[PDB]
Amino acid sequence: NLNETGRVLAVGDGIARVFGLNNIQAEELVEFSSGVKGMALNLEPGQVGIVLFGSDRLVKEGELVKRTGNIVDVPVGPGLLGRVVDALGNPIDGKGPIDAAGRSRAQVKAPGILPRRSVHEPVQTGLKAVDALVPIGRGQRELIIGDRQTGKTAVALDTILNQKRWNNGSDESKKLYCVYVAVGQKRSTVAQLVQTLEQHDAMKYSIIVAATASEAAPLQYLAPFTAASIGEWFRDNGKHALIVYDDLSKQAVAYRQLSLLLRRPPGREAYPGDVFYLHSRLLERAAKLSEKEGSGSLTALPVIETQGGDVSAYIPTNVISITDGQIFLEAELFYKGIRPAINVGLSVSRVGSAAQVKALKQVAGSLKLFLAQYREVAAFAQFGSDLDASTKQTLVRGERLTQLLKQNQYSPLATEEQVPLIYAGVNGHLDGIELSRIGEFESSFLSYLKSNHNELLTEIREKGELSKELLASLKSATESFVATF
Amino acid sequence: NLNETGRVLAVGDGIARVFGLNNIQAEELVEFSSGVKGMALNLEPGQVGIVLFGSDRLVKEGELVKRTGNIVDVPVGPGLLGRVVDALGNPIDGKGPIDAAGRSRAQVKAPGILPRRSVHEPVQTGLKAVDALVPIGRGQRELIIGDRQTGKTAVALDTILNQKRWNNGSDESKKLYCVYVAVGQKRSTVAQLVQTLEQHDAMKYSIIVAATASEAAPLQYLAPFTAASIGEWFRDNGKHALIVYDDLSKQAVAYRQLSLLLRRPPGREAYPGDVFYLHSRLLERAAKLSEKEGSGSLTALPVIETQGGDVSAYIPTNVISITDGQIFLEAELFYKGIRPAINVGLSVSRVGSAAQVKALKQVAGSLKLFLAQYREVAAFAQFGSDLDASTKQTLVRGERLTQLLKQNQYSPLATEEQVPLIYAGVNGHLDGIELSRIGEFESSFLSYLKSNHNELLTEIREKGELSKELLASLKSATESFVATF
Amino acid sequence: QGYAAEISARRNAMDNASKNAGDMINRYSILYNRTRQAVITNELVDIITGASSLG
Amino acid sequence: STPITGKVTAVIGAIVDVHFEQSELPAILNALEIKTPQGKLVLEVAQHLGENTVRTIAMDGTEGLVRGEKVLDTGGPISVPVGRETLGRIINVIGEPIDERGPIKSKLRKPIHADPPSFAEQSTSAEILETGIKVVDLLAPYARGGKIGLFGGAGVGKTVFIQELINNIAKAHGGFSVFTGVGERTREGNDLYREMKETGVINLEGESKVALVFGQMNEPPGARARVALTGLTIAEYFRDEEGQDVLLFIDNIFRFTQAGSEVSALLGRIPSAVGYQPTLATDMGLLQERITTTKKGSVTSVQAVYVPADDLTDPAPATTFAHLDATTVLSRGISELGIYPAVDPLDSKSRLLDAAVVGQEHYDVASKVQETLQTYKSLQDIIAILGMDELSEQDKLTVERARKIQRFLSQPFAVAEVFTGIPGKLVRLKDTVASFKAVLEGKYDNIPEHAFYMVGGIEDVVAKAEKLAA
Numbered sequence A, B: 001n002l003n004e005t006g007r008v009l010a011v012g013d014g015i016a017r018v019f020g021l022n023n024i025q026a027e028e029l030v031e032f033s034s035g036v037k038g039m040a041l042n043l044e045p046g047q048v049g050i051v052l053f054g055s056d057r058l059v060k061e062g063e064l065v066k067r068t069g070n071i072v073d074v075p076v077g078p079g080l081l082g083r084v085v086d087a088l089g090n091p092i093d094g095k096g097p098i099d100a101a102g103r104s105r106a107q108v109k110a111p112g113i114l115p116r117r118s119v120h121e122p123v124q125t126g127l128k129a130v131d132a133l134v135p136i137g138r139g140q141r142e143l144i145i146g147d148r149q150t151g152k153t154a155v156a157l158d159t160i161l162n163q164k165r166w167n168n169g170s171d172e173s174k175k176l177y178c179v180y181v182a183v184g185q186k187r188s189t190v191a192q193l194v195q196t197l198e199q200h201d202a203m204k205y206s207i208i209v210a211a212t213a214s215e216a217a218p219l220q221y222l223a224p225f226t227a228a229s230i231g232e233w234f235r236d237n238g239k240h241a242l243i244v245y246d247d248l249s250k251q252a253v254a255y256r257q258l259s260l261l262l263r264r265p266p267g268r269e270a271y272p273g274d275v276f277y278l279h280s281r282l283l284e285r286a287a288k289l290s291e292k293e294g295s296g297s298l299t300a301l302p303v304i305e306t307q308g309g310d311v312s313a314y315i316p317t318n319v320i321s322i323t324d325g326q327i328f329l330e331a332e333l334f335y336k337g338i339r340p341a342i343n344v345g346l347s348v349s350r351v352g353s354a355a356q357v358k359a360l361k362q363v364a365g366s367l368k369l370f371l372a373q374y375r376e377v378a379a380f381a382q383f384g385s386d387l388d389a390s391t392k393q394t395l396v397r398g399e400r401l402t403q404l405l406k407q408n409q410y411s412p413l414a415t416e417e418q419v420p421l422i423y424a425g426v427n428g429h430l431d432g433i434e435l436s437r438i439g440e441f442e443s444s445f446l447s448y449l450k451s452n453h454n455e456l457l458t459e460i461r462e463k464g465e466l467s468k469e470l471l472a473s474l475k476s477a478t479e480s481f482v483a484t485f
Numbered sequence C: 001q002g003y004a005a006e007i008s009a010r011r012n013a014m015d016n017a018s019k020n021a022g023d024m025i026n027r028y029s030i031l032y033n034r035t036r037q038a039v040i041t042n043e044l045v046d047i048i049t050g051a052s053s054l055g
Numbered sequence D: 001s002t003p004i005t006g007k008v009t010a011v012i013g014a015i016v017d018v019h020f021e022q023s024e025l026p027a028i029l030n031a032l033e034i035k036t037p038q039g040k041l042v043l044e045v046a047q048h049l050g051e052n053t054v055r056t057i058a059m060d061g062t063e064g065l066v067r068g069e070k071v072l073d074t075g076g077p078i079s080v081p082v083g084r085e086t087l088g089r090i091i092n093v094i095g096e097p098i099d100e101r102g103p104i105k106s107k108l109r110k111p112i113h114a115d116p117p118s119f120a121e122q123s124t125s126a127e128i129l130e131t132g133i134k135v136v137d138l139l140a141p142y143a144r145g146g147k148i149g150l151f152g153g154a155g156v157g158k159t160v161f162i163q164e165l166i167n168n169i170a171k172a173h174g175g176f177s178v179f180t181g182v183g184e185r186t187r188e189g190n191d192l193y194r195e196m197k198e199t200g201v202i203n204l205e206g207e208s209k210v211a212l213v214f215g216q217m218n219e220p221p222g223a224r225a226r227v228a229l230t231g232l233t234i235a236e237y238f239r240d241e242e243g244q245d246v247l248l249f250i251d252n253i254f255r256f257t258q259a260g261s262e263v264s265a266l267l268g269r270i271p272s273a274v275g276y277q278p279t280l281a282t283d284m285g286l287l288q289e290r291i292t293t294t295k296k297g298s299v300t301s302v303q304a305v306y307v308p309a310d311d312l313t314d315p316a317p318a319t320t321f322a323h324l325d326a327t328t329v330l331s332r333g334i335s336e337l338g339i340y341p342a343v344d345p346l347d348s349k350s351r352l353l354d355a356a357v358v359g360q361e362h363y364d365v366a367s368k369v370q371e372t373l374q375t376y377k378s379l380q381d382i383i384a385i386l387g388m389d390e391l392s393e394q395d396k397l398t399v400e401r402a403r404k405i406q407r408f409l410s411q412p413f414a415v416a417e418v419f420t421g422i423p424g425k426l427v428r429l430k431d432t433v434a435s436f437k438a439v440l441e442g443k444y445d446n447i448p449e450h451a452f453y454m455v456g457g458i459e460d461v462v463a464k465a466e467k468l469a470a
C-alpha cells in the first residue's frame, strides 16, 4: 500500500526509522509485524522516525509496519481505583480486565483562563509541619523538591493515607482520590509502595500508574500524561483528585534519551528546547474548575531530585518556576532528628492561608514568626549562658516548637488533633516541660482530651473555627493538664 | 590488483585516505612510495584511514601504497640494554644495529588470572619517605601523580639509580632492569637524562624509548605499548623489570589527535571514548607471574600531569582507578621545604606492608598513622592556644619525623641506612635535638655506624629482619651516640 | 579593670573580622558565578561537538 | 546444519560492520562468530543501518580482521553455561572456560539476554541479614535477598569490604554464590581464586559452592559491557530452575556504564550530559531489574559502585541509588582519619531501618548514635575556633562520647589483617547493639578513646583499656 503501511529502513537504540505511511498522523501509534508497538514523533519528507515501547530485538530491517489511526489514548474512570496499570493503561496486578467509563487522549489542553477559581479548599496532608506551615490547596501545584533519601515520598505518601478520614465518608465534595505515578522506579519498590497502602487500607481510593526503569523510555514519557487524564476525569465530573508525580526528574531523563537518539538539537545538559514545554503542559492541567464548570479540582505534587542541593540546575529551575510552592527537604535536617526534614526557611506556598483551615490558621499565623526569629538566633544557642534573657526566650520556644513538628512516619493527625498541640506550643505551656519529654507529651495530651474534653475536639472538627469561648475552654483544659503533669 | 596495493585519495595532518587495500588487516603496518610508513586504524569500504609516522609533505594524491602483512611489532631482548630506541625499536643513539633475540607485537594480551602471584618482593626506591610509607612491590603499578615542576620524574629516576646495588651482582633473581619511556618530552631533556644515568653507571641496565614531541602523533601513541613489550621480555624469562611511563597524560593527547583527525567522534574534552581502555590495557600488562611461568615480574611507575592541582580531572581519575596506589606530589609542600614533596595524606600503597621490607616494617608500624596525627595536631595548634604535654610531645616528634624524611635528589639510601634513622625517629631520640640539627645528624649518625657499629648494619642487610639480639645492640648503639656530643 | 579592657578589645576584634570575612564572601560569591557559568558552557561544548560530527 | 554466512565490511575500534544478504538479517542482540587462527572473535549485533548492513560490537581484540572475512551467524544471543556444572570454575564473557580445566559440561545453555521478571512475580521480604560489621548491622543492616550497594571513591575500601562479606556469609550460606569481576585489576581475581581454595569454598578435586565470572579491565569495551550479564545469567538459573538462595557479588558495577560510554560515540549516539550516553537510565535499568528476588527463589546481591572524582552527583552513581535497598556509602574524608571501614553513618541508610523490623530497642539506639555524630560534626566550627572549654556541660559530655562511638565503629577485618596487623574480629548484632547502648548511657565515660579504636566486641574495649594502663 505505502500509505497505510511502511518498511523498516533502519532500527536501533530503541528507535526504528520506517519508510512510507504517507498519511500517518503526528505522535500516532503504529504496529510492527512482531507485535511491539511504537509512536512516530518525527515526520520527515523521506522517512518517519518511530520510538519503540519494547525491545528493538523484535524489530528487523524491511519488516512491515501498519497504522493504528489513533493517538496515544488511555482508559479513564472510577474502575481504575484499586488497580495498578502501566503507562498505556493495561493491568499488571492480575485482577482481571479493567472497567473504564471511556478514554481520554494522553495530550489534553489545560483549562482556559476563564473556567477556574481561586483555590479555597484545603488539602489536609496530616503533616503538622505542612498543614501548619505550608498549606496545600485543591488545585494547587506544590512541589516536593529535595536531595536523595530526604523524605520526599513520605510527604506525599502520608498525605494519601490521611485521606481515610473523608473517602470512607458519604459526601463526595469532601473526598479525595489519589493517583500515584511511579516513574523510573524498580519493580521491587512499587510492589512495596503498593503493599504499604494496602496494610493501611488506602488502595481503596488510590490509582497506581507504574513505569518501571526496565520499561522503554517512551513509556516513562507518557506515564505522567496518562495518569494526568485519569485524574482529570474526577476533575471534570465535579470531584477532587490528587496526583503525585514521583518523579519528574526521571521523566526528563527518559525524554532526553528519545530526543537525542532522534538526533534533535541538544540544549543545556543535553535537554531539547521543548523540555520546559513538557512540564508546563503537564502541571497546568491541574487546577480548580469554577462553579459553572463543575467546581471540580486536580491537585499536583511533582517530585524533583536535586544533586547536592543544586536548585539552580536546569530541570529543577523549570519545575520550580511552574509550580506554586516548594517543600524543600534537606538530608542534614534529617540527621538531627527533625523528621520530616522540611526546611521551613525555604518551603513556601503562594496560596497560603487561602487553603488552610481557620481552626489552624488562628494558631499558625504566629508559629511562622517565632520559628523565623529562631533561625536568626540559632548561633547563640552554641554559646554560654551569657546570653541575655530576651534572646534566650526565643531559644526556649524554638527548641520545643521544632521538637513538636517532628512526626513519625505513617502517622497522620487530623486538624482536631493539630490545633491543641499548636495552641499549647505557641502560648508557651511547654517551656516549663523538659525538651526530652516533648514526644510523650503529644501522646498523653491527646488521650486526655479524648476522654475529658472530647466535646471541644468535635466542635473544632465540625465548625472548623475557634470562637472566643473555645479559645478560653481550650486554654483552661491545657493549663490543667500541664499543671497535673 | 588493488588487493595488495592502493592509491592515495587525500592526505594531510598526518592522515591519509588511501583507496584499495582490501586484504590489509586491522592496525597493520604499511609503506608508501615516498619511503614513509603508516598505520591503518579505520577500515571502510570506500577508503582506508591511515596515520603517518612521519611528515606528510611527501605523500600526494594518487601515490602507490603497499602493505607489510604484519602487525606493528618491536625488537626485544637483552641487546637493547644500554641502547636508546624509538617507538618502532630502531636505534637513535648511533651505536650500531639493535641485536634483538625475538620480536613481539605492540598490543599484547595481559597475563592470565591463573598465572599470577601475590606481590611479596620489595622495590628499593632508595627514598626513605617512600620505602617507609608507600613501599613498591615487584608486580604492581605505583602512580606518580602531581603538577608540573614538583618532582615526579625525580622519584622514578632515583629508583633506577638505587638498583645499582644489585645489578652489579651475580645473582639474577635479585637484580632489577629499568625501562624509561620518554613521551612528549623534548630531545634536549631526554639527552640530559641519559647523560645523568651514565654519570652514575646506570645506563648499562637501562633501556630508553624516545617519543619526543616533534615526532608524529602515532609514535607518541605507540611508544608506551612497544616499550612495555620490551620489558615484558624479562618478566617471561624469569627476570624482573621496572618500566616507567612519563607520561601517559601526553600519550592521551597524542591518541586524541589521531581520533579527531580520523574524524572519530570525541567523548569528553575531545578525548576518544575508549580513552580509559588506552591505559587499562597498558598497566594490566605488568604483574607478578606464577612460579610455573618463571617467577618473572614487571613493575610500573606511570606518571601523570595535573593542572592547578586538580586530581578530579578526566585522564587522572581514569588512571588512579587502575594503579595500585599513588605518590601524590604537591608544589606547596616543595617550597615549605618538604623535598621530595610527598603528601602522605593522599599517597597510599594498595600492596602495603606486603611489599615493604620486613626489617623496615618493624621500626615503622603506625608511623604513617602518626604523621596523620601530626597534621591533625599541627592544624589545631594554629588557634594560638597553649598545648599540654601530650599534644606538644607528638607535635615535637611529628615535626622532626617530617624533617627526617627530607632527602636530597640523586642520593639513594640503602635499606641498612634507612632502618637506623627511622628507628631513632619513631622512638623519640630526636625529640631532644633542635630541628636545624636533624640535617647533619643523619650523615653523622651513619658515619658513626659505618666506623664502629658496622657489624649490625651487616646483619640487618643480610637477615633483612630484626632479632631479639639485634634490637639489643641496635638499642645501645643509638643511645650511646645521643650521649656523644 | 583589665578584664573590662579585654572584652572591649575582643568586641572590636570580632567586629572587623565579621566585616572582612563578610566582605570576603561577597568576593568569592562572584567567583562562584563565573565558575558556575564556565562549567555550564564547557559541558555544553562537548555536547555540541559530539553532534556536529559529519564527514 | 543451515548456517547464515556474512562478510565484514568495516572495522573501527570495537565496532565491526557486517554485510549479510537479503532476508538473512539477524535480529538485534544476536551473537556472531569469525574463525581465526588464534581463536574466535564473537560479535554482537547492535543496529541495522539498512541495506543489509548490521553494526556489531567486538567481544575481543579487533586487530587481525581482514576487510571481508566471512562471519558465521550464531543464530541467537551469546550463550553461557548454566547449572551446578559451572560451580568452582572460572568463566569469561563468551562462556568459555578460562581455568585450564577442560570443557564445562553443562546440560543447558541459556542466553545472557532476557526480559525482567513481571511485576506479579515480585516478592517483598523484610528479613534482616547478619554480616558481623558493627557500623552496618547497627545503622544500615542488609536485607536477606536484597540489593546492597557499596559506594566510594578510589581507594576507600570497597573491595576489602565486599571481600569480608564473602568471608562471613559465603561459607555460612548453605547455598550457591556467583562472583562477577567487571572492569577490575586482574590480580585481585588471582588472590580471590587463591583464597577460595584455602578457605575450602572451591575444591578442585571436590565440591564447590560458587562460580567465577571475570571480564576485567584489560578487556575491550565490548567485553566489560556484557560481562555483568554473563554472570547474572548463571545466578538467575539457580534462582528459578534451582529455586534456592543465591549470593551475587558484582565488582565493579560502574564499569558496566563506563564501558558502554566508550563505544556509544562510535555507534552514532549524541553524547548526553557529562559525556555519558543517553541510554544510561535504561541500560542501568535492564540490569538491576533482572537482579532481584522472585517467588521462585531468593537472591542476595552485593554490588560495589564506583564514584568518579568522589562526586555523588555523577549520573552513574546517582542513578544506581534507586535500584538499591541498602546503601553503604564510603567517604574518603573518613579514610584519612584512620578510621575504617570508612563508612559514612549519616549518608548510609537502609530499608530494614525500621522499628517493626530490627526491633524498637534497636531503632532507638541507632537513632541516638546518629544524632550524637551529627551534633559533633555541627560543633566542628566551635571546637577549632573557640576550643573545647567553651562548649556547655551537655555539649562536652556529648562530644567526648561522639568521639568514642566514632572510633568504636572501626573494626579489624580478617581480610585486611595484613594492613592493620590486628586479627580480624566478627561482632554479633545482638552484642553490637548492647555495646553502643551501654556507651550511650555513659557507663564508660572513664575509659580512654584509644580503647575504642580498632576494637571488636565491647568486652575488648574494657580489656584494651586495662592492657594500656600497664
Ligand SMILES: Nc1ncnc2c1ncn2[C@@H]1O[C@H](COP(=O)(O)OP(=O)(O)OP(=O)(O)O)[C@@H](O)[C@H]1O
Pocket (backbone or CB within 6 Å): A147, A148, A149, A150, A151, A152, A153, A154, A155, A305, A339, A340, A407, A408, A409, A410, D321, D322, D349, D350, D351, D353
Ligand atoms: N517522617 C518520617 N519519620 C521517620 N522516618 C522517615 C520519615 N520519612 C522518611 N523516613 C525514612 O526515609 C527513608 C526513605 O525516605 P524517602 O523515601 O521519604 O525519601 P525519597 O524522597 O523517597 O528518596 P529517594 O529519592 O531515594 O526515594 C526510610 O528508610 C524511612 O526510614
Ligand SMILES: Nc1ncnc2c1ncn2[C@@H]1O[C@H](COP(=O)(O)OP(=O)(O)OP(=O)(O)O)[C@@H](O)[C@H]1O
Pocket (backbone or CB within 6 Å): B147, B148, B149, B150, B151, B152, B153, B154, B155, B339, B340, B407, B408, B409
Ligand atoms: N629531592 C629533591 N630535592 C630538591 N630539589 C629537587 C628534588 N627533586 C627534584 N628537585 C628539583 O625540582 C626541579 C624539577 O624536578 P622534576 O624534574 O622531578 O619535576 P618533574 O615532575 O619532572 O616536572 P616535569 O615533568 O615538568 O619535568 C628540578 O630543577 C630539581 O632540581
Ligand SMILES: Nc1ncnc2c1ncn2[C@@H]1O[C@H](COP(=O)(O)OP(=O)(O)O)[C@@H](O)[C@H]1O
Pocket (backbone or CB within 6 Å): B348, B349, B350, B351, B352, D152, D153, D154, D155, D156, D157, D158, D159, D160, D161, D340, D341, D411, D412, D413, D416, D419, D420
Ligand atoms: N579495614 C581497613 N582498615 C584500614 N584500611 C583499609 C581497610 N580496608 C581497606 N583499607 C585501605 O583501602 C585500600 C584498598 O582500597 P580498595 O578496597 O581497593 O578501595 P576501592 O574500592 O576504592 O578501590 C587498602 O590499601 C587499605 O589501605
Ligand SMILES: [Mg+2]
Pocket (backbone or CB within 6 Å): A152, A153, A246
Ligand atoms: Mg521516592
Ligand SMILES: [Mg+2]
Pocket (backbone or CB within 6 Å): B152, B153, B246
Ligand atoms: Mg618530568
Ligand SMILES: [Mg+2]
Pocket (backbone or CB within 6 Å): D158, D159
Ligand atoms: Mg577496588
